[PDB]
Amino acid sequence: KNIDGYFKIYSKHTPINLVRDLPQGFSALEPLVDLPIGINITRFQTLLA
Amino acid sequence: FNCYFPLQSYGFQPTNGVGYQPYRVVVLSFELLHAPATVCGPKKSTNL
């Protein structure tokens, strides 16, 4: 998320056993990264291996 | 003639006067835009 130029990144890892779709459940995300950069971001992309 | 080098050299010698000695000068210019501040005061703490 972006709040007043601050980029906030929360994450959470969990072990699952499923290959079809998303396993239904509940899981919280703790605050991990907060960067005071101030870049207006409108698009993004991913990169696999 | 009529075409001189743009840069000239400093004649720094230890036997010259104070006005000819090399002086190191640093200008600290602070910029504060609408972006969040990232270089902030130390805010020295006290005992508890």
Curated annotation (Swiss-Prot), chain A:
Q: Please describe, based on the UniProt annotation, the reported consequence of changing V19G.
A: In strain: Omicron/BA.2, Omicron/BA.2.12.1, Omicron/BA.2.75, Omicron/BA.4, Omicron/BA.5, Omicron/BQ.1.1
Glycosylated at which positions?
N40
> Consequence of mutating A28V?
In strain: 20A.EU1
Note the subunit structure.
Answer: Binds to host ACE2. RBD also interacts with the N-linked glycan on 'Asn-90' of ACE2. Cleavage of S generates a polybasic C-terminal sequence on S1 that binds to host Neuropilin-1 (NRP1) and Neuropilin-2 (NRP2) receptors. Interacts with host integrin alpha-5/beta-1 (ITGA5:ITGB1) and with ACE2 in complex with integrin alpha-5/beta-1 (ITGA5:ITGB1). May interact via cytoplasmic c-terminus with M protein. May interact (via N-terminus) with host bilirubin and biliverdin, thereby preventing antibody binding to the SARS-CoV-2 spike NTD via an allosteric mechanism.
Give the protein's function.
Attaches the virion to the cell membrane by interacting with host receptor, initiating the infection. The major receptor is host ACE2. When S2/S2' has been cleaved, binding to the receptor triggers direct fusion at the cell membrane. When S2/S2' has not been cleaved, binding to the receptor results in internalization of the virus by endocytosis using host TFRC and GRM2 and leading to fusion of the virion membrane with the host endosomal membrane. Alternatively, may use NRP1/NRP2 and integrin as entry receptors.
The protein's name in its UniProt record: Spike protein S1
Q: Which organism is it from?
A: Severe acute respiratory syndrome coronavirus 2 (2019-nCoV)
Q: Which gene encodes it?
A: S
Q: Which residues of the full protein are shown?
A: 195 to 243 of 1273
